[PDB]
């Protein structure tokens, strides 16, 4: 079957990389990327028994472009 | 320019692919000036 669940990617445009998604999160770390001053930050769900992650980044080629990458799905609709 | 999409894909979809999934991505609209 085609691999996607590890690397659920979501793009948007915004004056900044602070964005909402209707879930609740803690941050566990951060790494550097090419072509942009901001770090990529990584998060994990704070719902009980939920092993979902994401990482969030601005792009190199614009101030205004922003991407989130999720890993696994939340079986919960409550934040 | 095309306008700031901000929250447009922040929905709680079930699938592996959010409804506006592209090449991670481009504005599909016609450019009123040169690129
Ligand atoms: Zn969760």
Instruction: Output DSSP code: residue A39.
Output: P
Ramachandran angles phi, psi of A54, nearest 5° = -145, 165
Asked whether the beta carbons of residue A5 and residue B14 sit closer than 8 angstroms, the reply is no
β A25-31/A40-45 pair status: antiparallel
What does DSSP say about strands A25-31 and A53-58: parallel, antiparallel, or unpaired? unpaired
- For the record, the structure tokens of B21 come out as 């999934």
Chain A residue with the nearest C-alpha to that of B23: A11
Structural domain spans, chain A: 5-71
CB atoms within 10 A of CB A78: 8
Tell me the nearest-neighbour CA distance from B18 into chain A, angstroms: 7
CA-to-CA dists, residue B14 to A7, A38, A45, A77, angstroms: 15, 30, 16, 10
Displacement of CA A61 from its chain's centroid (Å): 19
CATH code that applies to domain A5-71: 2.20.25.80
Instruction: From residue A4, give the alpha-carbon distance in Å to each of A1, A72, A76, B10, B17.
Output: 9, 9, 20, 18, 8
For the beta sheet containing A53-58, the strands, ordered from the edge strand earlier in sequence to the opposite edge, are A8-13, A65-71, A53-58, A40-45, A25-31
């Amino acid at each position: 079957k085609t691999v996607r669940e590890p690397r659920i990617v979501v793009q948007t445009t915004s004056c900044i990389d602070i964005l909402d998604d209707g879930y609740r999160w803690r941050k566990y770390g951060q790494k550097v990327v090419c072509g942009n001053p901001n770090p990529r930050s990584y998060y994990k769900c704070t719902t009980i028994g939920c092993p979902v992650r994401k990482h969030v980044e601005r792009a190199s080629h614009d101030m205004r472009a922003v991407i989130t990458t999720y890993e696994g799905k939340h079986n919960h609709d409550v934040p | 320019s095309n306008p700031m999409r901000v929250q447009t894909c922040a929905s709680k979809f079930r699938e592996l692919v959010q409804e506006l999934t592209g090449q991670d991505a481009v504005d599909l609209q016609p450019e009123p000036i040169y690129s």
